[PDB]
């Protein structure tokens, strides 16, 4: 009926030794175009070459892992063929080894990690990259390019390289990969898994002081015990501070109760008891005045 047409074509790519590369080729036509990937004049076959069809059926994705230099250096060919037509596209893959990496090549400063999100909540897969020039961040889920398009939809990429998925579905879980690209080449971050679990709702109570810090009056030279207790869900960490000076280290942070025992302070200052939880921070004042 209608000969095929290229809706999307690959681009020249450059990668490291042991990295990966992806060429996206999708086409339209009636009949559905048959996508072929060729190295020289023959269809690609090897243990490291993996073709991934699109869920649309419009095309596939050629993924090469890992990258072997100079075995994989060559020109590659996408072929969209059907009953009434055959059409082709070419792209060039160059792979340089680990000591051939120039400065400014995309490097992933912070890669994504394991992330577990409840269903219909917001999951954020972090990424950070640098290089000269500043690299562009793209995402791949299950060897397929993530669609970050600003067209109204769920998946949105942030100002930082981090990817954000609101209202997480079950099909959102999989293997995510961060991809930094610039004029110097293309670099993939280490893969990270996103686990989607069923929603469990539980009453979340912000911190409130069960026992607020009690104003105490002791003449200089003495020692007093100030009881400061806080409650909530989650139960907040309790910490004492004189001004900006933390009076307990982060190693031991009593969750239930924190009492402040002062040593022979003959001058006057205002002490602050703090209760910290993921639901926000509350702080109350205890006034010790020396006469």
């Amino acid at each position: 009926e209608t000969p095929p047409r290229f809706t999307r074509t690959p681009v020249d790519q450059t990668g490291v030794s042991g990295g990966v590369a992806s060429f996206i080729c999708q086409a339209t036509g009636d009949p559905r175009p048959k996508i072929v990937w060729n190295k020289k004049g023959k269809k690609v076959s090897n243990q490291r070459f993996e073709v991934i069809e699109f869920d649309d059926g419009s095309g596939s994705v050629l993924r090469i892992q890992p990258l072997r230099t100079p075995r994989d250096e060559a020109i590659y060919e996408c072929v969209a063929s059907n009953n009434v037509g055959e059409i082709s596209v070419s792209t060039r893959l160059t792979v340089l080894r680990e000591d051939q990496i120039p400065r400014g090549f995309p490097t992933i400063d912070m890669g994504p990690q394991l992330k577990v999100v409840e269903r219909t909540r917001t999951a954020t897969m972090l990424c950070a990259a640098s290089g000269n020039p500043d690299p562009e961040i793209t995402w791949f889920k299950d060897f397929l390019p993530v669609d970050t398009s600003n067209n109204n939809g769920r998946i949105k990429q942030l100002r930082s390289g981090a990817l954000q998925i609101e209202q997480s579905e079950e099909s959102d879980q999989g293997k995510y990969e961060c991809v930094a690209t610039n004029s110097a080449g293309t670099r993939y971050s280490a893969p990270a898994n996103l686990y989607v679990r069923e929603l469990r709702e539980v009453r979340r109570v912000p911190p409130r002081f069960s026992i607020p810090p009690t104003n105490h009056e002791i003449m200089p030279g003495g020692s007093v015990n100030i009881t400061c207790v806080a409650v909530g869900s989650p139960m907040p960490y309790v910490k004492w501070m004189l001004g900006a000076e933390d009076l307990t280290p982060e190693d031991d942070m009593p969750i239930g109760r924190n009492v402040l025992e002062l040593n022979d302070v003959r001058q006057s200052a205002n002490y602050t008891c703090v209760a910290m939880s993921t639901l926000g921070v509350i702080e109350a004042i205890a006034q010790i005045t020396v006469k």
């Binding site: 990690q113 577990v116 954020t124 280490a190 686990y195 982060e250 942070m253 910290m276």
Partner: protein, 361 residues
């Protein structure tokens, strides 16, 4: 090369297989006998009292294939004692007193398919100690004191079938250890210190799960049961597997302490988002001086602390800056280029949380 067939005085040598055999087993030797025909394919020294392996002992043996030192007193092996055997496929050092694996130990071995160190006292292994042998089909470290092993050399063995770490002190397994490693049947982590386990396709194939009327085999055997598992979302992928119950038990968090790992429902495995405990609100120091920035965040698991320069991406260990494990930031030479608003970010599998510090110079 053509010579007579010499035998140790106290041993029995057999020509019966085309491989020359020298059987010294259970002869009460205090040391490796001086006279052994260098053409020996199979040498059994096992169940003797030898405390020391000198270089002279195993020197200039070309055709040796099996060498069994098992059940000896050996506390020491001279470097390059095994340099000579290019054809050795199996070395049994098991049930000995070795407290260390030196880098020159096994530095002549290549074609070795079995290295059996099990039931030794080893507290440490040199970083390059395993670099010489990448061909090992089997590596048995069982029953030792090891806190960790040179993993990057372990993943460099692609022929590895079974790795037995069981009954050791091992802290943790790196995430990318088994990534490109294949052909691996078995891994035994039992009776170790592991809090968590990294995901991996092999561990996805450790489970047996199938619909009724269909049978799914197990291509990978994995036993972690002996560890003080810290049970949170990080182990959720493991809890979702369908496996036998080996009676592994959760040590932490305190809510799950004592509970069997497979008895706990998936929803009860819980990790908690980061919460920033401490910060330095504002800081003033001049140029070219020692600076320190405090950011400490808590959570389950303990979150990863990273920094953000003003209107910038990420700091790191570098020429102009240094980052630490406990979260402190040291800019050794401060500059007016660094004046601005720094962002502290703490990441967790559950989520991330940020605060801000301000710096004027």
């Amino acid at each position: 090369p053509g010579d007579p067939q010499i035998c140790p005085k106290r041993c029995v040598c057999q020509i019966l297989s085309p491989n020359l055999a020298t059987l010294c087993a259970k002869k009460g030797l205090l040391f490796v006998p001086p006279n052994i025909d260098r053409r020996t394919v199979e040498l059994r020294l096992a169940d003797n009292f030898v405390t020391n392996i000198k270089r002279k002992d195993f020197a200039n043996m070309t055709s040796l294939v099996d060498l069994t030192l098992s059940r000896n007193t050996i506390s020491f092996i001279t470097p390059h004692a095994f340099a000579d055997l290019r054809n050795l496929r199996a070395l049994h050092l098991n049930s000995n007193r070795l407290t260390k694996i030196t880098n020159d130990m096994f530095s002549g071995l290549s074609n070795l398919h079995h290295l059996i160190l099990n039931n030794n006292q080893l507290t440490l292994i040199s970083s390059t100690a395993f670099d010489d042998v990448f061909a090992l089909e089997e590596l048995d470290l069982s029953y030792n004191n090891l806190e960790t092993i040179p993993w990057d050399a372990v993943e460099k063995m692609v022929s590895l079938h079974t790795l037995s770490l069981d009954h050791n002190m091992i802290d943790n397994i790196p995430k990318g250890t088994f990534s490109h490693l294949h052909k691996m049947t078995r891994l035994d982590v039992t009776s170790n210190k592991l809090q968590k386990l990294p995901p991996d396709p092999l561990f996805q194939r450790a489970q047996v799960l199938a619909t009724s009327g269909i049978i799914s085999p197990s291509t990978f055997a994995l036993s972690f049961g002996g560890n003080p598992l810290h049970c949170n979302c990080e182990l959720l992928w493991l809890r979702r597997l369908s496996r036998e119950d080996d009676l592994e038990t959760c040590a932490s968090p305190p809510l799950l302490t004592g509970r069997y790992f497979w008895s706990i429902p998936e929803e009860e495995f819980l990790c908690e988002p980061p919460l920033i405990t401490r910060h330095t609100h504002e800081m003033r120091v001049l140029e070219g001086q020692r600076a320190t920035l405090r950011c400490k965040a808590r959570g389950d698991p303990e979150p990863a602390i990273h920094w953000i320069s003003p209107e910038g991406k990420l700091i790191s260990n570098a020429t102009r800056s240094l980052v630490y494990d406990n979260g402190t930031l040291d800019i050794l030479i401060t500059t007016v280029k660094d004046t601005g608003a720094f962002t502290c970010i703490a990441s967790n599998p559950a989520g991330e949380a940020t605060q801000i510090v301000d710096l004027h110079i």
